Structure 1
Amino acid sequence: RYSKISDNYSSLLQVSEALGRAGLESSNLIVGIDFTKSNEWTGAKSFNRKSLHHLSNTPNPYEQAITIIGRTLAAFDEDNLIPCYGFGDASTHDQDVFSFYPEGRFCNGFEEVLARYREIVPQLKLAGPTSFAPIIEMAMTVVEQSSGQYHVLVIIADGQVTRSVDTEHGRLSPQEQKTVDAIVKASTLPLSIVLVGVGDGPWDMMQEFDDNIPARAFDNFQFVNFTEIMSKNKDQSRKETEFALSALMAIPPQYKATIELNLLGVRNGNIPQRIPLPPPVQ
């Protein structure tokens, strides 16, 4: 379906226009970046055995993903203020996020997101394990503090949530329990969640993930495999639009649901205030 819609789009501007015709209006963007040690090995097949956070004169998968999403959503962003967070490094493990800037100051535009990313990356100690509960809970706090403005949280990651050793007997890890609880609670807020997968994966358990989440107020989650789409036999510009559409197509019906449920523009009243740690840098 995504390939069929994207086949006629050679410009990201065309994707933006399609999102608008589907009903998207003013939208803020929140970015969360996976800084786990796993990034050092998950480019074994897809990134010539370099770390996925490797910096050079050409953008790595994190930079590429941020650029495409940033460009596509920019026209909907009425303040251009993008709060950005890291998680999975030694300062946060699976418990916290850190803000890109001290005191949690927001980035001004996706270009500053990219620039600040490049500044921070070499100074980080990569760690683990992998949970998305802290980043989703941080996004919840931002949405609530904004008085219910619509936000899209984009998480870019190179692995699934850490599993239990006894997963074969149906057991969940604490990372899974807390991440899934967070996705459920998030649907009390006007928030869309997009998980962008970069690198080798594996990702095979993500095609069923959203369908297995417990009862929610609305379907608020979408997975997209960046690396798989960008590896297809398709010209570069149309691969980029296929990625943008696959990532964001679910967003306008989610937005309309926040309006139907009357979540837009109001406060929930039951959102813990998560405090992001400072960037562990110069």
Structure 2
Amino acid sequence: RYSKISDNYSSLLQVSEALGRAGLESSNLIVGIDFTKSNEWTGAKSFNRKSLHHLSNTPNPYEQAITIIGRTLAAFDEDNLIPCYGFGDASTHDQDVFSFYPEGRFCNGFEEVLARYREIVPQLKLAGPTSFAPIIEMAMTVVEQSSGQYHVLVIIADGQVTRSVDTEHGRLSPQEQKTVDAIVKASTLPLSIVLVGVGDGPWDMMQEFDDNIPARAFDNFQFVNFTEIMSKNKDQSRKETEFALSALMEIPPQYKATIELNLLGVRNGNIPQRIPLPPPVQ
């Protein structure tokens, strides 16, 4: 489907212009980066047995995804300010997020996101387990504090939310419970959530995860498999446009939904204020 569309898109500029014609207006971007220890081994097939957070003269999958999404959404970002958070390292585990800059200061453009990411990475201790509840709750808090301006939260991760050891008997983990609850509660705000999967996975459980999210006033969640798209044997430009479209094609409909439900521009009033930890760096 996005493959069929991308066959006509040679640049991210075209994708940006298409999003605009599709109704997307002022749109803000929040980025959350997975710093769990599994990043050390989920690059076995997709990244030459290197860590997915390996730094070098070629971008790792996190840097690549940030670049494509950032370049595509930049045109809609009026203040160019991107709240950016890490989670899953030893300072946050599955409980918190940390801001890329102290005092929760936002990054100035995706270029600063990328630069600051490279500074932070060598100082982190990767940990776990995996929950997206803190990062989704952080995004909720930012949306509320902005008085309901429309945000897209892009979570880039190398593994699904941690499951129960007794998952075979239908039991949910607290990580699953809180993450699903956060997705549902986030639908009371003008907020879209895109989960970008990098690395080997496994990601075969995501369709089912999506299907099992409880009913919401609008569908505010998308999963996109970066690795599967970028592993196709076609030109770089069209792998990039396919990924951009696969991640963002549904953003303008979702935006329109937040207007129809009168979520846009208002405070919900029921949103706990999550506080980001400082970046755990020198």
Distance in 1, matches of 2:192 and 2:280, equals: 28
Report the counterpart of residue 231 of structure 1 in structure 2: 231
**Deviations along 1:89-112, whole A, 9 cap, x unmatched?**
000000000000000000000000
Distance in 1, matches of 2:107 and 2:2, equals: 31
Report the counterpart of residue 96 of structure 1 in structure 2: 96
**Deviations along 1:188-245, whole A, 9 cap, x unmatched?**
0000000000000000011222221001111000000001100011111000000000
Which stretch of the first structure deviates more once superposed, 206-215 or 145-154? 206-215
**Structure 2 length normalisation: TM-score?**
0.99
Distance in 2, matches of 1:208 and 1:4, equals: 24
What does 1:247-266 align with in structure 2 at a 5 Å threshold? 247-266=247-266
How much does 1:11 deviate? Answer: 0.2
**Structure 1 length normalisation: TM-score?**
0.99
Distance in 2, matches of 1:210 and 1:258, equals: 20
Distance in 2, matches of 1:46 and 1:75, equals: 31
**Deviations along 1:96-146, whole A, 9 cap, x unmatched?**
000000000000000000000000000000000000000000000000000
How much does 1:176 deviate? Answer: 0.1
Distance in 2, matches of 1:277 and 1:236, equals: 37
Distance in 2, matches of 1:208 and 1:23, equals: 30
Distance in 2, matches of 1:208 and 1:13, equals: 33
RMSD (Å), alpha carbons: 0.5
Question: Could you list the runs of 5+ residues in structure 1 that have no partner in the other structure?
Answer: none
1:125 aligns with 2:105: no
Distance in 2, matches of 1:128 and 1:209, equals: 20
Distance in 2, matches of 1:146 and 1:209, equals: 30
What is the DSSP-based 3-state SS (H/G/I as helix, E as strand, rest coil) of the residue aligned with 1:184? helix
How much does 1:161 deviate? Answer: 0.3
Q: Identity percentage over the alignment?
A: 100
1:84 aligns with 2:81: no
Question: Could you list the runs of 5+ residues in structure 2 that have no partner in the other structure?
Answer: none
What is the DSSP-based 3-state SS (H/G/I as helix, E as strand, rest coil) of the residue aligned with 2:273? coil
